[PDB]
């Protein structure tokens, strides 16, 4: 029922599993249980135009646990590439994830999410976050701990997918 295939990718130990758990339960995970391959989680929202479902494929961010790797990306309907703003490397690795993703889904709405902006000492200053511009990715600052822009990525993705720019998430 109006569900889409969403692929969450990014460097391991950045928050992908954290973000997915925060959206599913509402609690904020503290520990980093390194993901193995991919976990599929349904996630429901109530927009002004009814229910919506994201099939979040929270994929492992560590190569040693890459498993099927890009194989997971097949049939993906939307993509969230996510990094950590406190670790420059997790950003510089972003283009690799982007290339791998695009190689399977040429034309799919893509959101670059900077997780855990809450931490005081930000490393990847917004001034240097530019990769999205040329590639036409939609950027978003988020923080799974402070809940900042929690639904912004999903709201933007739903607007892109459905085609309703004025579509709005409702509480129930």
């Amino acid at each position: 029922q109006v569900q889409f295939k969403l692929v969450l990718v990014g460097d391991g130990g950045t928050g992908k599993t954290t973000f997915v758990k925060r959206h599913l339960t509402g609690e904020f995970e503290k520990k980093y249980v390194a993901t193995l391959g991919v976990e599929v989680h349904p996630l429901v929202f109530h927009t002004n135009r009814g229910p919506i479902k994201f099939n979040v494929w929270d994929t492992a961010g560590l190569e040693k646990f890459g498993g099927l790797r890009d194989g997971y990306y097949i049939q993906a309907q939307c993509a969230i590439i996510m990094f950590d703003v406190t670790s420059r490397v997790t950003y510089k690795n972003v283009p690799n994830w982007h290339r791998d993703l695009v190689r399977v889904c040429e034309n799919i709405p893509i959101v670059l999410c900077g997780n855990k902006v809450d931490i005081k000492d930000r490393k990847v200053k917004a001034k240097s976050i530019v990769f999205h511009r040329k590639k036409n990715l939609q950027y978003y600052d988020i923080s799974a701990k402070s809940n900042y822009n929690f639904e912004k990525p999903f709201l933007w993705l739903a607007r892109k997918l459905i085609g309703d720019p004025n579509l709005e998430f409702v509480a129930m």
Partner: protein, 1050 residues
């Protein structure tokens, strides 16, 4: 629909695999859920890891019917090619290469498969790219010419060949780092450059002659990727720019890719093609105006446009930004192009109105570049030369007039689309408290800062026009023509943004006029909502202009009185606004609050103190804390120690009263500590105390000493109370509000300790009077506490103290560790995930101790020191990147400290050096720690350097007085061979030699380590041709010569 044993049955490689069974497995993976999908994932991952799986891959492709299963087989093939291509039999390599080439050709022959199996075709193209990277140009140098001929034979074949060329270029240039050795990448780049001419000729032929729009688009994409690195001669010395602008820029199906290529070209900053750039611009604009009339509402087009149109508009903005930033000086000197220049700027205005943050960001970037150049030119005259009404015009440097017709529209855009200066969220902490957090350095805050800088520069250029613009929009609000809360808020934000950009008198007059108009508006409007909006805006504006307030005492007094009047308001947001403005005004005018103001015989602070209770009757605890912070700022401005003491005493009188009452009650009975209301009162009191300490600081000591001892007891009285409850119900009780408030009070106590300590300035007194009580009250309690009850903030808190106290705390360090160390280590030494806060704070404490209490390490038993080292090794083996970096920094600082201690250096080396090498190399060889690479080499180069510089006087093998260098070389070679037997000995020998040669070129050392890691991923056969061993050896000998030249020069 399958049992794990049934799935593993496929792992019997002596039997034919059921292709239908694999199709079922993959369909279950992509449509099954939970245990079924997890099982399928696990089984397929295991199979892909199998060595001989490739033996079936060929049979799979001929029989496979599911493109997904074909993709999995191709993944297996990619692993094989990326691992063992130098070990696979040559005959089988060539056979499978022919197989894949034929399959690609057959697929390209069917257009339906081309549309249907695009992902499969792309995977095939990437597999071939890897194959060629292993082979090309050595074993297939004739490939490129043949394929271009083949390209000439068929349009679809040409399309696929350009796609494969694009992938090759991406892999060679854009994504080579981290996957390919430096020398192999250099060789591939050289070969590509050498053969590029054929590709360029082919693409130009296709562009001029091809009509297959998909083929043209693929050609444009491949050219786009080539544009990253190809020599400029191929770009600007052909019909390329004109061809793109005339054939494709006007075509919607190609405009996006063409304009992307044009933007990349625009980014080239070289004079050798000046005129070309101009032509590129001149024609481009000519085309743009045909496609996109300057009278079109770009905002409406975007909001009503599709994905392609919006992407095109974004690309247009990017192209204009890049080209103008790089060629403004070029376009300025040509008068005949002046009109066209304006058109470009015109577009940006129309672009700047689009309702997308990123487009406005690009526009702001360009506008700020313009404003920076103009404010580097103008102030020489305007700032360092006085001006009069309209005198700016006469002194105008020539370059400004060029853009002058657009400065006022830029100002209007800024004042119309200014973003919120500060973002605040309501966040639920772990303690269940919803609090207001002020975001910092977020994207939006950077946006506001850039807008503020641009507008401030423009104000410096022409402040009168800006002032007229705010005044005009303010009137538009007063007359109600442009009435809306958003517009007023934006205007007021803009007005505040430019504080200090104007001369004192002009800013004074502008503020007076603005405030008078605002108060008139407030009198005009009906409805509490709008009146509160206006009042909040006025308060924010005045807060943003503290200079005027400092110059006018009476207005300040009136403002603060009105703020206190507001504080009693119940309507939403009024109180929070008033508190925020109050703290801002306090921060910016403390001197005026405590300095006796003319017309007043006592500082206003006295009345504030007397009327606190009246002021706070209608305030929330958070607002109370914020107000107390404000007062603390004012108090800290005081200089007289005794007057400050009395002011603080009167200041904390009410929290002190409640605290003393509760202390007496606890003395009567301790069960009251379980009173939820009492615990919440403690939380509020302690939040007030921490805010006051933060605002006031070291003088707060007099306040702290008032309760310190008692408060410590409370902590103990609190801590024990928790443990039993946990023992009663485990961690579940922690979810109860009571336990949460207990932990909240604990955390606030620790936060107060840290807050005061950080800003202290009498370390002797701090250590003598304040630490021993903490030793007994908490540390002994902390060890006595059960693990789950132990509060991680304790650990880090202690670090802060030593971070400030250094040597003064050294004598007390041992007792601390014997109290906390093993119980902490025994709590984290089993895995890497539980108690992350404890891990991080513990390593923070270790880092502080190492940084500032090294002699404590000098004074501990060797067993404790070895435990510390094992803990560190556990640390930088962590996956938590923060933990890893902290551990590595600790290790580096420890090595430097050892170097500072001559006596124990040799002993420490002999004891730990080889184990340290083993551990560091085990981590480095692990890909999961690549993020720490920069630090790894930093220490390695140092460590190896220590060996080379003879600073390790003793032989690391006392039984053999060999050169430490030679022994280390052999030891590392043996270690690596043991870990990686399949490697070629020459590889390891060269790698070690470089490690010694590269101990002073840190980036080169890092690239050397990356090359070694890439090598580790490959099963390297005796074929060293692809390894370019002699080339890297020559480069390494050159680097060693450079290093020895640096040494002689030093």
């Amino acid at each position: 629909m399958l049992a794990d044993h049934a799935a593993r049955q496929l792992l019997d490689f002596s039997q034919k695999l059921d292709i239908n069974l694999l199709d079922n497995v993959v369909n279950c993976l992509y449509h099954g859920e939970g245990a079924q999908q997890r099982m399928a994932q696990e089984v397929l991952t295991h199979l892909k890891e199998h060595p001989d799986a490739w033996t079936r891959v060929d049979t799979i492709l001929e029989f496979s019917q599911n493109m997904n299963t074909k993709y999995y087989g191709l993944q297996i093939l990619e692993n094989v090619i990326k691992t063992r291509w130098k070990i696979l039999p040559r005959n089988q390599c060539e056979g499978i290469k022919k197989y894949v080439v034929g399959l690609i050709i057959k697929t390209s022959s069917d257009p339906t498969c081309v549309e249907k199996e695009k992902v499969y075709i792309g995977k095939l193209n990437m597999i071939l790219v890897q194959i060629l990277k292993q082979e090309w140009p050595k074993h297939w140098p004739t490939f490129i010419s043949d394929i271009v001929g083949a390209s000439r034979t068929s349009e679809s074949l040409c399309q696929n060949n350009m796609v494969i060329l694009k992938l090759l270029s991406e892999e060679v240039f854009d994504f080579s780092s981290g996957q390919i050795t430096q020398v192999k990448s250099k060789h591939l780049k050289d070969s590509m450059c050498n053969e590029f001419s054929q590709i360029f000729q082919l693409c130009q032929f296709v562009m001029e002659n091809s009509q297959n729009a998909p083929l043209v688009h693929a050609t444009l994409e491949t050219l786009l990727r080539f544009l990253n690195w190809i020599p400029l001669g191929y770009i600007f010395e052909t019909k390329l720019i004109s061809t793109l602008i005339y054939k494709f820029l006007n075509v919607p199906m190609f405009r996006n890719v063409s304009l992307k290529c044009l933007t990349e070209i625009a980014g080239v900053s070289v004079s050798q093609y000046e005129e070309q750039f101009v032509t590129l611009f001149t024609l481009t604009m000519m085309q743009l105006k045909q496609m996109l009339p300057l009278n079109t509402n770009i905002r409406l087009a975007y909001s009503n446009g599709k994905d392609d149109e919006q992407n095109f508009i974004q690309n247009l903005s990017l192209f204009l930004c890049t080209f103008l930033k790089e060629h403004d000086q070029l376009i300025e000197k040509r008068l005949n192009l002046r009109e066209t220049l304006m058109e470009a700027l015109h577009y940006m205005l129309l672009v700047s109105e689009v309702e997308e943050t990123e487009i406005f960001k690009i526009c702001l970037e360009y506008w700020n570049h313009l404003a920076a150049e103009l404010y580097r030119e103008s102030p020489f005259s305007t700032s360092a030369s006085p001006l009069l009404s309209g005198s700016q015009h006469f002194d105008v440097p020539p370059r400004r007039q060029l853009y002058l017709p657009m400065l006022f529209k830029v100002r209007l855009l800024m004042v119309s689309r200014m973003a919120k200066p500060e973002e605040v969220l309501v966040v639920e902490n772990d303690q269940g408290e919803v609090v207001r957090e002020f975001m910092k350095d977020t994207d939006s805050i950077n946006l506001y800062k850039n807008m503020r800088e641009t507008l401030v520069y423009l104000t410096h250029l022409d402040y009168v026009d800006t002032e007229r613009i705010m005044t005009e929009k303010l009137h538009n609000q007063v007359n109600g023509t442009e009435w809306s809360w958003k517009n007023l808020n934006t205007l007021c934000w803009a007005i505040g943004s430019i504080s200090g950009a104007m001369h004192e008198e002009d800013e004074k007059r502008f503020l007076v006029t603005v405030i008078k108009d605002l108060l008139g508006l407030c009198e005009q409007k009906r409805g509490k909502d709008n009146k509160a909006i206006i009042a909040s805006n006025i308060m924010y504006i005045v807060g943003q202009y503290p200079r005027f307030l400092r110059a006018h005492w009476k207005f300040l007094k009136t403002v603060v009185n009105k703020l206190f009047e507001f504080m009693h308001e119940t309507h939403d947001g009024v109180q929070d606004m008033a508190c925020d403005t109050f703290i801002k005004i306090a921060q910016k005018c403390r001197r005026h609050f405590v300095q006796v103001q003319v017309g007043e015989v006592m500082p206003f602070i006295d009345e504030i103190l007397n009327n606190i209770n009246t002021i706070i009757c209608d305030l929330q605890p958070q607002q109370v804390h914020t107000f107390y912070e404000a007062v603390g700022y004012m108090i800290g401005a005081q200089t007289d120690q005794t007057v400050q003491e009395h002011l603080i005493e009167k200041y904390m009188l009410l929290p002190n009263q409640v605290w003393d009452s509760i202390i007496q009650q606890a003395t009567k009975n301790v069960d009251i500590l379980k009173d939820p209301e009492t615990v919440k009162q403690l939380g509020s009191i302690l939040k007030t105390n921490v805010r006051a300490c933060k605002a006031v600081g070291h003088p707060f000591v007099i306040q702290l000493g008032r309760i310190y001892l008692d408060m410590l007891n409370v902590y103990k009285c609190l801590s024990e109370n928790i443990s039993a409850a946990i023992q009663a119900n485990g961690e579940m009780v922690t979810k109860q509000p009571l336990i949460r408030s207990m932990r909240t009070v604990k955390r606030e106590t620790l936060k107060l300790i840290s807050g005061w300590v950080s800003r202290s300035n009498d370390p002797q007194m701090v250590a003598e009077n304040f630490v021993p009580p903490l030793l007994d009250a908490v540390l002994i309690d902390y060890q006595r506490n059960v693990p789950a009850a132990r509060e991680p903030e304790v650990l880090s808190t202690m670090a802060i103290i030593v971070n400030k106290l250094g040597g003064h705390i050294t004598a007390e360090i041992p007792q601390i560790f014997d109290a906390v160390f093993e119980c902490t280590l025994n709590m984290i030494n089993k895995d890497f995930e539980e108690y992350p806060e404890h891990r991080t704070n513990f390593f923070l404490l270790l880092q502080a101790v190492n940084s500032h209490c090294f002699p404590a390490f000098l004074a501990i038993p060797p067993t404790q020191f070895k435990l510390v080292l094992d803990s560190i090794i556990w640390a930088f083996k962590h996956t938590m990147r923060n933990v890893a970096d902290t551990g590595l920094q600790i290790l580096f600082t420890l090595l430097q400290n050892v170097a500072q201690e001559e006596a124990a250096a040799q002993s420490f080396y002999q004891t730990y050096f080889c184990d340290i090498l083993q551990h560091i190399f085990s981590v480095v060889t692990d890909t999961s720690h690549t993020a720490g690479l920069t630090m790894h080499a930093s220490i390695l180069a140092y460590m190896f350097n220590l060996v080379e510089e003879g600073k390790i006087s003793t032989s690391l093998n006392p039984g053999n007085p060999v050169n430490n260098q030679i022994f280390l070389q052999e030891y590392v070679a043996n270690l690596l061979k043991s870990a990686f037997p399949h490697l070629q000995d020459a590889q390891v020998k060269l790698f070690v030699t470089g490690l010694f040669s590269l101990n002073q070129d840190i980036p080169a050392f890092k690239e050397h380590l990356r090359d070694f890691l890439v090598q580790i991923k490959e099963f390297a056969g005796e074929d060293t041709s692809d390894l370019f061993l002699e080339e890297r050896e020559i480069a390494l000998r050159q680097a060693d010569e450079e290093k020895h030249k640096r040494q002689m020069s030093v």
